[PDB]
Design a protein around this nucleic acid. Structure first.
Ligand SMILES: [Mg+2]
Ligand SMILES: [Mg+2]
Ligand SMILES: [Mg+2]
Ligand SMILES: [Mg+2]
Ligand SMILES: [Mg+2]
Ligand SMILES: [Mg+2]
Ligand SMILES: [Mg+2]
Ligand SMILES: [Mg+2]
Ligand SMILES: [Mg+2]
Ligand SMILES: [Mg+2]
Ligand SMILES: [Mg+2]
Ligand SMILES: [Mg+2]
Ligand SMILES: [Mg+2]
Ligand SMILES: [Mg+2]
Ligand SMILES: [Mg+2]
Ligand SMILES: [Mg+2]
Ligand SMILES: [Mg+2]
Ligand SMILES: [Mg+2]
Ligand SMILES: [Mg+2]
Ligand SMILES: [Mg+2]
Lengths: 176, 102, 46, 322, 237, 394, 158, 124
RNA sequence: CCUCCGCAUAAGCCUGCGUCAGAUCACACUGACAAUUAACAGCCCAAUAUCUACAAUCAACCAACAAGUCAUUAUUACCCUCACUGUCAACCCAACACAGGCAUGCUCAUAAGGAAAGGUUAAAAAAAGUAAAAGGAACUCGGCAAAUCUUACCCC
RNA sequence: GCUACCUAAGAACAGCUAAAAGAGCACACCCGUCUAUGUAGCAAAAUAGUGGGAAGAUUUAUAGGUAGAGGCGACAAACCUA
RNA sequence: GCUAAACCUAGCCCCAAACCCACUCCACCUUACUACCAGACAACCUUAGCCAAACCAUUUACCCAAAUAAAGUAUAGGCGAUA
């Protein structure tokens, strides 16, 4: 129930609730899938409790008892997500040989930049799709000058960063 | 339901959309105004549907839920920093869950 | 009569007139967006 | 700006909130050819009338249940007109509006340029009962004006807007179903069919078994208070000139299969704060729990016809003015 | 601009079709014709200008009953709702076309000429020399483009070879083949040229925007010009 | 001739094909592999596509000739929205019927007797008119789509109030949303009546016959009137995808199987959308014929014969102010020839119930000229309504 | 597209002038491909074909810069491929004509691998190379199965 | 002028604009007839929540735990720890058919599967 | 004492006088914490063919002209639900807490909404009114203004 | 997004005269005759009074169109973002 | 003695060298930053003018493939300006 959104009533106002170390990614790799599913839900209920407590601390203009608990539960579930995604990535690379889960393509644009178009899910094919054929994956010849000017600006910024690098080095060698 | 993930398209006659590890995280919030006795107020993500808050609260917390209503609360963009650039307080979803079985 | 009240706002008009899709609909408007990206503007269209 | 009140509502415990808004005490209970005709009405709409278009179940409450209800009312008014001689001169209406506007309580305006100022809490019930029989002479008075009822009306520690209730500013109407020039101003029995949104099946799917009777009771209280107060204001009674005689009206509310029976008695229109400062008159609503009329309709026959539910329809309609 | 023409429907009907005015503007949105704008909203009653049009699955000459003679906003003539078999259509009413009448649409060219009854569509080779004719085609089966405005009549003047020569209301002679179809008589509303607008507002109701205020000096084109009549126009190859 | 639809509104042809498709032996290079259009590569030829599975919101029906119930012969269908050009006499030709002006003396006599009248009858009908046209809704002037069915329902209930005097009005019911069907041949033309909308006064007892068998055989000398050049089927849907089944509208075993009065309403708020009186009478005639035929075919078979027991169906048709009354007697189902016994129809047409209603006082020159209420009430019209209602039980 | 001087007078107005060719639509038969082609040509192409003694000879001798036609260079590629594969579809029932018309144009025979790229513009060539190098990825299951088997062969040898 | 620097939300613009834009919640059905919404259950995400009675894993780890070196799982490790025993134990016995790798786990196609790894058709 | 206002919707704007804490004409400022909950409104609809002459005006009588804003049928296809979004304010366009501009419904007559005087004195000149003996256009370019409420006639 | 003209589909017009009106009186509403005040103003064209119209070639909300060697104009060489 | 005044560091400029920049997830050409539906449209045309010629009307230098030199030469040009 909602008593699981709140803490233990004996911890209310205890100014510090001790804790334990966040789950390390190697330990989560040692555990199996089903246990990682169940631990995901255990950690989810703990994170909901901690977020509820932090918002009520803000409401009452009092410090949260121990925010390290919220930080460590976020790290624990990030590590769990990492472990499960590594296992799926390994199986996908083994079975299909594809290194991404979503299809996509390197394409050009109406602006002449090369982008990674991530694919969308459709029911009709692309030649019959209206909106898709309204989009332009090609740059007509009036984009090349703006591409050249964009490259030149990037060169003007890099040359500045590297000259300052050398000026700063000489000022350091002036002092020491 | 989950955030920031592509959903598999459903074509009629297809399997149930099942989520296994949801990244939906909610906060129970004290109501600012007076509410009835059956009302529990939550702060939920923008991409969480009232059908999914009901399913979330009845699957993970085993809370019988009779009604769910939601609204979108706007955060202020009025505040400005030292550069006169407006600072945006975020937008969130508020949900009012009316419990079941009295 | 008295002037200055020449902006009579309408969101449909502001998006039909100076929005992204109209800009991309003409090649000259594409170059308007390209000119604004080169300048580094934070609001390329309306 | 007034609260729109819907008798047929999705909001939980709306019977208690409507009991507050209308100052009503709910009290449980009440204060062969007919069978054949009722079974004919059900089986005419469920099996016999060949329907060209496939009836989807979202349309069933409007294609099947509604024609059964007004056909049943028409036939059972025609056949009981021998025994009740007022039903021959009664006026039977199909889907006519019944509006009521009233003021109950005060608030202080919380924000804006009008902040800190007294504002009346106005409510408007907008109803359209499926059927309604209106007589030209008032019925009897069930219980006497100044009845006791040691029960006490529900109160809320919360703004009326919390049970989903919203505000709008439209035309304030006070109508009985016809204008003020109709000779048939008094109300007899109303007949209501609950919509498809508020079915027993959906209200069991949404964890609201407790609220199957709630929506029946709330529809009763709101609809009968609206019709009965409209009648009083047609006779010229308002909050500062209250009713000298009690105004009554009865109502059957149904889902197609389950029927509930209600009787309301308006004893007061003094619901504003100034007129309710020392008013002891409390409006009353008696009612019964829902009961099925039939069990299933298998091909050409009704399995479980409950003759008790019909005998109650017959007695309501057999109520007559003195 | 985005100007789609309202003239989109592809099926004949007697239902009045909602028109869309132009303002004198082309598909580019620029004015092409000055003086057009803002009259009463008008609906279009489609006119069948091919009088000899046998109904699908029928072949020869056929009769139609005149049911109504109505006002048309879109032209200066009255229109006639007629019906034969299972088909109702709008035609151009002749001068004395009355409701409840019977008119014949024929394609037969006999050795003799026919007694030309008003309102009846006959071939010009079936008509007598001297018949007042309305709604004429330039080629056999093209439909009526000429003599269509109110009170206008042309004259069969000569039947020669397989050609029939006519006098068009501008007094101009026009030669066609004898198989072309022409209605007999004068178009209805013969007093249409005696109408008095009476009012600049009535002209704006008809949808005529006012003339320009700019003064123009008259040119060499301007005086009276007594030209010879143009030569006979032939549509017979 | 002039052809409808201009080129600028007619869809354009695709661009001319790339010449590389006419050069034999060549594999054209298209943008099909890029999955996006490129202006500098050839436009591919995409093969035709099909879903394969049935999505109901994206369905495409089969071509019309490949439909199961497709027949090369046309069936001309009369439904509630058909508006006959020739009206009553076209209906009389299409149903093989002789028309008699006025109602039967049997019916007009059931109310000539004055114990069959309603108590305070004229004031009760005036109250019905006033409730329908003024007192009904919150609107000051109620519209026709509301007042017409309201006035018909309240007249039916006011007539139904005589169950005190006649305890055989309990064998009746007024059915809505009932649809009947009847098909017959008529000079080698297949006609169908699909009857829908209105109310069906359904009874347990067949209506008694009106004309004697001597009058029925006396009908064998009235030539049906024809209306050349108009085809008898001018305004009936020429359908080519149809079925031929009779239908009374009710499955077998309905307690109230006999049609007594069909109540037809011209409810439309606009005069072009309302039927002319002749067209309304024609609609009543073909609907009464359809109900009578459906009953005759149900009980007596699909055979063609002069009916030994004729079938009587009445119909009242109104817009709310004018009423028309019809009694129809099916004397035969042998209809393909125009010779022999004809059906009969007694018609009382264009009976006003009131000339006008004033929903607001007419105050010209600060003095009330016309008072509020009905103008020109006709209790004779109401008496004909009651007589048709009490036919069969009075 | 160029400019002129009013009436051959440099002290007069310089005006803009465009000179366009006389364009004629005509039909040609190509012996190698066996197809009639309706082509808009100039009177120059007609003589250039008369001097070539045939449309196929004009197409196969004239290079890109003087052909000035994407249609011409695609025609050249198709003609040159039918020749490289001795396509048995040129007059399929009549190999003696097939051999004779192939022997007439034997001198322009180039290898098929250098004929598949004749007349291709760079975008079409880039698409051709991408389509021939597409190669949907191979499973690491198969890769590691081959690896495990090779190492187990070495262990079985030892 | 108008504010062209803040985010375009569904709170701005006229009625039609406000109702046609949303906040990013995925659809759980379609719209038909009189703007009537049909919810499709299979398009509603079902939360697959396990039984947590008898579970010994708590949200935090004790600090008295030995430190472990990080080792990201690779496809090489998955092959060496999932199918390599079977392949070795079938080669030493001598019954490896190099054409039926389907028995060792290899999925030729991902079609016909309920949880296809490319293109991914399953939620997290 | 004023009320030529007001309350809603639309459009526009986007937290812009809610609570707590805090400074330095007179005390809507800064930071924090909250809030607008759908039934109103938005967001619609399988195909192919086919159908659709008869205004509106209390629609009756009656007269029109400029000739009009509201309609189907046949046969296939079709199981399921109450999702998503707007909802606050003393508010928008005019550089401004601008005597300006601003669509519609109700109240238009108030049950809503508001304050012309910071305090004094009571000079000139100036502004806005009110009264004025006798006279009554003598004024002035002109009866402008004001007051009355008023005749006849040129030119265009 | 002002304004000039147009397209689509909308909305408003009390009361009195006479009942026929690009009719008269007259609100709302649209305009702007004359006077005074104001002239860095409340206002980069306003205010008060007085006026012209107010069922019409009227006024007006919304979306769209025509763009500068142009557009649009009941010609003021008007108007096309003070 | 108030207001003030002072200040060296952000960084920048010209060169040299050297071939510069794009897939956490999700969203984004529709009213961009919008999970999800029957289409298809599609790129290529000599700059001109200010200015100089003391007006202006032909004419009036504009990187085009490492320096230098031939050479401001041959040539061109209202045989003028200039090129
Ligand atoms: Mg006309
Ligand atoms: Mg016209
Ligand atoms: Mg003129
Ligand atoms: Mg002029
Ligand atoms: Mg709604
Ligand atoms: Mg509000
Ligand atoms: Mg007040
Ligand atoms: Mg003051
Ligand atoms: Mg002062
Ligand atoms: Mg004086
Ligand atoms: Mg004088
Ligand atoms: Mg003087
Ligand atoms: Mg004056
Ligand atoms: Mg006037
Ligand atoms: Mg006037
Ligand atoms: Mg003008
Ligand atoms: Mg001038
Ligand atoms: Mg001038
Ligand atoms: Mg010069
Ligand atoms: Mg000089």
């Amino acid at each position: 129930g909602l008593e699981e959104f709140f803490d233990d009533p004996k911890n209310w106002g205890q100014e510090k609730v001790k804790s334990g170390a966040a789950w390390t990614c190697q330990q989560l790799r040692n555990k199996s899938n089903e246990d990682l599913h169940k631990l995901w839900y255990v950690l989810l209920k703990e994170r909901n409790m901690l977020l509820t407590l932090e918002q009520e601390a803000k409401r009452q203009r009092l410090p949260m008892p121990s925010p390290e608990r919220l930080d460590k539960v976020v790290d624990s579930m990030d590590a769990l997500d990492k472990v499960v995604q590594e296992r799926e990535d390994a199986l996908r690379l083994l079975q299909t040989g594809q290194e991404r889960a979503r299809p996509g393509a390197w394409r050009r644009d109406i602006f002449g930049r090369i982008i990674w178009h991530k694919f969308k899910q459709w029911v009709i094919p692309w030649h019959l799709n209206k909106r898709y054929n309204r989009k332009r994956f090609f740059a007509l010849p009036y984009v090349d000058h703006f591409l050249r000017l964009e490259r030149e600006k990037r060169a003007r910024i890099k040359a500045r960063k590297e000259n300052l690098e050398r000026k700063k080095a000489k000022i350091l060698l002036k002092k020491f | 339901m989950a955030r920031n993930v592509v959903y598999p398209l459903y074509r009629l006659g297809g399997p149930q959309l099942r989520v296994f590890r949801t990244n939906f995280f909610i906060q129970l919030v004290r109501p600012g105004v007076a509410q009835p006795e059956d009302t529990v107020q939550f702060r939920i993500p923008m991409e969480m549907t009232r059908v999914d808050l009901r399913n979330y609260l009845e699957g993970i917390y085993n809370v019988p839920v009779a009604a769910v209503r939601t609204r979108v609360q706007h955060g202020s963009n009025k505040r400005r920093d030292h550069r006169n650039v407006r600072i945006k307080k975020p937008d969130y979803k508020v949900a009012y869950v009316q419990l079941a079985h009295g | 009569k008295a002037r200055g009240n020449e902006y009579q706002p309408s969101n449909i008009k502001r998006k039909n007139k100076h929005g992204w899709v109209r800009r991309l609909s003409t090649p000259a408007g594409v170059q308007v967006i390209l000119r604004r990206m080169l300048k580094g503007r934070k609001s390329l269209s309306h | 700006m007034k609260y729109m009140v819907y008798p047929q509502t999705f909001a939980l415990n709306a019977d208690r909130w409507y009991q507050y808004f209308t100052k009503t005490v709910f009290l449980s209970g009440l204060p062969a050819a007919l069978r054949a005709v009722a079974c004919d009405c059900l089986l005419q709409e469920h099996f016999y009338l060949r329907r060209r278009r496939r009836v989807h179940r979202y349309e069933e409450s409007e294609v099947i249940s509604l024609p059964f209800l007004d056909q049943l009312v028409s036939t059972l008014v025609g056949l009981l007109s021998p025994h009740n001689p007022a039903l021959a001169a009664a006026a039977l209406d199909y889907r006519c509006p019944v509006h009521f506007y009233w003021v109950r309580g005060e608030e202080i305006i919380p924000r804006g340029h009008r902040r800190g100022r007294i504002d009346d809490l106005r409510y408007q019930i907008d109803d359209k009962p499926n059927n309604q029989i209106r007589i030209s002479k008032q019925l009897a008075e069930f219980v006497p004006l100044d009845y006791s009822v040691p029960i006490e009306i529900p109160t809320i520690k919360c703004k009326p807007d919390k049970l989903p209730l919203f505000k709008r500013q439209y035309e304030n109407h006070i109508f009985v179903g016809s204008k003020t020039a109709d000779p048939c101003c008094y109300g007899h029995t109303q007949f209501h069919l609950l919509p498809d949104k508020l079915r027993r099946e959906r209200l069991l799917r949404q964890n609201c078994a407790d609220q199957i009777e709630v929506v029946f009771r709330a529809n009763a209280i709101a609809s009968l208070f609206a019709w009965t107060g409209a009648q009083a204001m047609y006779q010229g009674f308002w909050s500062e000139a209250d009713v000298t005689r009690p105004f009554v009206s009865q109502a059957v509310i149904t889902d197609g299969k389950y029927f509930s029976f209600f009787c309301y008695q308006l004893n007061t229109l003094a619901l504003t704060t100034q007129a309710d400062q020392n008013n002891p008159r409390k409006n009353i609503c008696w009612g019964t729990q829902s009961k099925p009329l039939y069990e299933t309709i298998e091909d050409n026959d009704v399995k479980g016809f409950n003759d008790d539910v019909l005998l109650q329809i017959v007695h309501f309609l057999l109520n007559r003015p003195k | 601009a985005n100007f789609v023409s309202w003239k989109s429907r592809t099926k004949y009907t007697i239902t009045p079709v909602k028109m869309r005015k132009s303002g004198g503007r082309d598909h580019t949105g620029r004015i092409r014709v000055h003086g057009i704008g803002g009259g009463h909203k008008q609906r279009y009653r489609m006119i069948d200008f091919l009088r000899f049009r046998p109904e699908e699955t029928k072949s020869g000459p056929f009769e139609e009953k005149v049911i109504q003679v109505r006002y048309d906003p879109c032209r200066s003539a009255d229109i006639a709702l007629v019906a034969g078999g299972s088909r109702k259509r709008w035609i151009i009413a002749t001068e004395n076309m009355q409701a409840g009448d019977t008119i014949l649409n024929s394609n037969h060219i006999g050795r003799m000429a026919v007694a030309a009854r008003e309102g009846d569509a006959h071939p010009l080779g079936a008509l007598p020399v001297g018949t007042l004719i309305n709604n004429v085609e330039s080629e056999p089966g093209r439909g009526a483009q000429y003599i269509r405005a109110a009170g206008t009549c042309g004259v069969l003047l000569r039947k020669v070879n397989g050609t029939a020569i006519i006098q068009l209301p501008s007094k101009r002679q026009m030669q066609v083949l004898e198989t072309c179809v022409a209605t007999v008589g004068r178009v209805s509303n013969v007093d249409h040229n005696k109408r008095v607008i009476g009012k600049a507002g009535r002209n704006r109701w008809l949808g005529k925007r006012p003339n320009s205020g700019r003064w123009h000096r008259k040119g060499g084109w301007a005086g009276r010009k007594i030209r010879p009549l143009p030569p006979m126009k032939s549509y017979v190859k | 001739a002039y052809e409808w639809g201009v080129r600028s509104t007619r869809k354009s042809e695709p661009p001319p094909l790339d010449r590389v498709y006419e050069i034999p032996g060549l594999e054209p290079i298209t943008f099909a592999g890029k999955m996006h259009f490129v202006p500098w590569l050839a436009r591919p030829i995409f093969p035709p596509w099909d879903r394969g599975y049935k999505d109901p919101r994206f369905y495409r029906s089969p071509p019309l000739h490949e439909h199961p119930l497709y027949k090369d012969q046309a069936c001309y269908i009369f439904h509630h929205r058909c508006r006959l050009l020739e009206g009553v006499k076209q209906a009389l030709w299409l149903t093989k019927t002789k028309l008699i002006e006025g109602l039967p003396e049997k019916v007009l006599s059931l109310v000539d007797d004055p114990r069959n009248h309603i108590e305070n009858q004229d004031e009760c009908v005036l109250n019905v008119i006033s409730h329908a046209r003024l007192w009904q809704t919150t609107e000051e002037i109620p519209k026709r789509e509301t007042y017409c069915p309201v006035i018909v329902d309240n007249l039916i209930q006011l007539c139904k109030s005589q169950i005190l005097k006649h305890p055989s009005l309990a064998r009746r019911i007024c059915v809505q949303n009932s649809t009947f069907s009847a098909t017959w041949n008529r000079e080698s033309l297949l006609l169908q009546v699909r009857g829908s909308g209105g109310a069906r006064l359904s009874t347990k007892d067949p209506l008694p016959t009106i004309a004697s068998r001597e009058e029925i055989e006396a009908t064998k000398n009235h030539v049906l009137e024809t209306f050349y050049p108009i085809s008898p089927i001018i305004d009936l849907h020429e359908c080519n995808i149809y079925d031929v089944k009779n239908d009374t509208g009710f499955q077998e075993g309905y307690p109230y199987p006999y049609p007594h009065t069909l109540y037809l309403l011209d409810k439309a708020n606009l005069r072009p959308h309302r039927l002319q009186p002749d067209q309304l009478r024609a609609k009543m005639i073909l609907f009464a014929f359809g109900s009578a035929l459906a009953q005759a075919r149900l009980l007596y078979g699909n055979d063609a014969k002069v009916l030994e027991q004729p079938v009587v169906v009445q119909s009242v048709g109104t817009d709310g102010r004018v009423f028309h009354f019809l009694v129809f007697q099916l004397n035969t189902t042998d209809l393909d020839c125009n010779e022999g016994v004809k059906n009969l129809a007694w018609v009382d047409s264009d009976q006003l119930l009131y000339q006008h209603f004033w929903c607001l006082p007419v105050i010209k020159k600060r003095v009330v000229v016309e008072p509020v209420g009905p103008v020109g009430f006709k209790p004779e019209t109401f008496r004909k309504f009651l007589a048709l209602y009490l036919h069969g039980a009075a | 597209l160029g400019q002129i001087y009013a009436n051959n007078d440099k002290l007069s107005k310089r005006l803009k002038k465009v000179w366009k060719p006389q364009l004629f639509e005509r039909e040609f038969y190509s012996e190698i491909l066996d197809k009639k082609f309706t082509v808009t040509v100039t009177m120059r192409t007609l003589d250039l074909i008369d001097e070539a003694y045939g449309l196929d000879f004009y197409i196969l001798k004239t290079p890109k810069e003087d052909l000035c036609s994407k249609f011409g260079m695609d025609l050249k590629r198709g003609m040159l491929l039918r020749l490289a594969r001795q396509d048995p579809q040129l007059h399929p029932e009549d190999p003696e004509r097939r051999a004779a018309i192939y022997d007439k144009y034997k001198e322009f025979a180039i290898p098929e691998e250098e004929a598949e790229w004749v007349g291709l513009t760079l975008e079409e060539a880039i698409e051709k190379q991408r389509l021939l190098e597409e190669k949907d990825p191979v499973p690491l299951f198969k890769i590691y199965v081959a690896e495990l088997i090779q190492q187990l062969q070495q262990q079985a040898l030892s | 002028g108008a504010d062209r620097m803040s985010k375009w939300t569904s709170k701005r613009g006229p009625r039609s604009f406000r109702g046609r834009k949303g906040r990013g919640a995925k659809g759980i059905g379609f719209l038909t007839s009189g703007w009537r919404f049909v919810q499709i259950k299979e398009m509603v995400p079902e939360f697959v929540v396990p039984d947590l009675t008898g579970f010994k894993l708590k949200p935090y780890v004790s600090y008295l735990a030995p430190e472990s070196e990080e080792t990201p799982l690779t496809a090489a490790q998955l092959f060496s720890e999932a199918v390599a025993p079977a392949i070795e134990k079938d080669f030493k016995d001598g019954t490896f058919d190099p054409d039926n790798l389907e028995k060792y786990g290899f999925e030729p196609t991902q079609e016909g599967k309920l949880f296809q790894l490319y293109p991914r058709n399953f939620l997290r």
